[PDB]
Amino acid sequence: DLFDQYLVYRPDWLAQWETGHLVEGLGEAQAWQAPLWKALVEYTHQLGQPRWHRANLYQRFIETLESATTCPPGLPSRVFICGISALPPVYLQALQALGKHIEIHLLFTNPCRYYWGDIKDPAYLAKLLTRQRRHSFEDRELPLFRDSENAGQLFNSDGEQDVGNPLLASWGKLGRDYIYLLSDLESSQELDAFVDVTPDNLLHNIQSDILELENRAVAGVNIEEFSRSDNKRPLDPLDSSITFHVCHSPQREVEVLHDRLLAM
Amino acid sequence: MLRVYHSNRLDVLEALMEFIVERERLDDPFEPEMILVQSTGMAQWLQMTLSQKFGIAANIDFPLPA
Amino acid sequence: AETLDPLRLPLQGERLIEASAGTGKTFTIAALYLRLLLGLGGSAAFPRPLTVEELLVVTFTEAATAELRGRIRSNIHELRIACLRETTDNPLYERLLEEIDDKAQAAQWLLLAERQMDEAAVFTIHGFCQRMLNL
Amino acid sequence: LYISYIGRSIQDNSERFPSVLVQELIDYIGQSHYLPGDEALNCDESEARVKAHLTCLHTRMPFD
């Protein structure tokens, strides 16, 4: 299992272990992880079975596809990927290599309508001054086009501090890395297709707060702010979209689900 | 051409791929228009939605990325 | 055979505390927990602060674990709010806020520590050795 | 949305607790809005009132 995960995720350590030298900057157990892999390589070579594997196969594929003309033999015209949000970076390298000839359309989905990922360098943020066209009409970009990078939205070492919604700030660790990998390519096409939401119901208020990259929580730093309780938006007394029912036994909870669903 | 579309819902993106395959018909309709997914239930849902819209669902395959 | 305050005990070596019947044995342990999480206690304090993934606490019965974890979460949440508002009501939090050196740093540490609560180390003896041997 | 959890143990009537995600969600909800009754009373009191109002409490036996 560990070797399969290594084959999928780390090609460079396997390349080092093929020639047997250690990899500098790692903890224990590597001194027996490496020569076991090398001895497995020589044993499966002596068995006579084919030796082609994924870690060098990706590099060979990238080389033979980049060093090629515009006419490949027997490849499909187009293919779409949808409903996926966590991929190895080598797959993204393979698809950006494949993007020279075959048209693809990544149907990636994100909660927020703007950028909320990490930052590499102050030189790197200059690359993110492009635009995202709409479907047919105009273009769009993250708000405060100069003021975001001007102010302390991005700090020198870490990602985005003032995320806004604490829900996203707590739960978007996968999404930050995914948008960081996706917003780094050079042969890419970025254009949005979004749906607005009208805040009337409680759930729609929550979703609009998530989408708009804002916050609606008051802490009351000053005593006037602590005393007042009308700065918030009001609440419908019969908005029953979000509930919180507390039960004791699982069977009783399932019965509550049953008759509540029938009543609904 | 690597094209990326952001989203807030899956329905408008499914409508967009319907719009693409309608505004550009492949000259060999018997070719399997491959679509990648992450499960079997998602492929089932895409098949059901495509049959619901087009009145037909045939010659579409859903393999794993690997 | 001396007295005890939560803000005065030097946290080094081995110490034994006996709290008699009708003491509570919980309002103190949360105070020492926050004391180690924030690294206060003068020169007698620990040399460096820690994180929630290092403070192992082992009780014996099953039901006390979840109750202790919930009380701990409520205490750290209330301490964070009281630190952002600079005005408390509990004398314990009042003296802690008196002992605060940097409110912004303390608030940042509490923000980064509260969201890591879900994997914090509170076990029984059997669970502790079960999670150590498979490690 | 329908979110539920086991609140109290049925044997000794002790206390259990919901997960941290649900606790964060209800904290954000309580610090987000206010009930129409006490529109200008207190931020934290209104938050506690909203938390009490949204929570529903069932019983042990069906025929109560």
Output the keywords.
part of a larger assembly, 4 chains, A: 264 residues, mainly alpha, Rossmann fold, two-stranded parallel ribbon, two-stranded antiparallel ribbon, 7 strands, 10% strand, extended, C: mainly alpha, two-stranded parallel sheet, 5 helices, 2 strands
Could you characterize the architecture of this molecule?
- This is part of a larger assembly, with three copies of chain A and one copy of chain C (135 residues).
- By secondary structure, chain A is mainly alpha-helical.
- Helices cover 40% and strands 10% of the residues of chain A.
- Chain A has eleven helices and seven strands.
- In chain A, helix 4 runs parallel beside helix 5.
- Chain A binds chain D through residues 166-167, 170-171, 202-203, 205, 209, 216-220, 225-230, 232-235, 237, 241-250, 252-253, 255-257, 260, and chain D through 1-10, 21-22, 24-26, 28-29, 31-36, 38-46, 50, 54-58, 60, 62.
- Chain A: This is RecBCD enzyme subunit RecC.
- Chain A: Heterotrimer of RecB, RecC and RecD. All subunits contribute to DNA-binding. Interacts with YgbT (Cas1). (Microbial infection) Lambda virus GamS protein interacts with the enzyme without displacing any of the subunits.
- Chain A: Belongs to the RecC family.
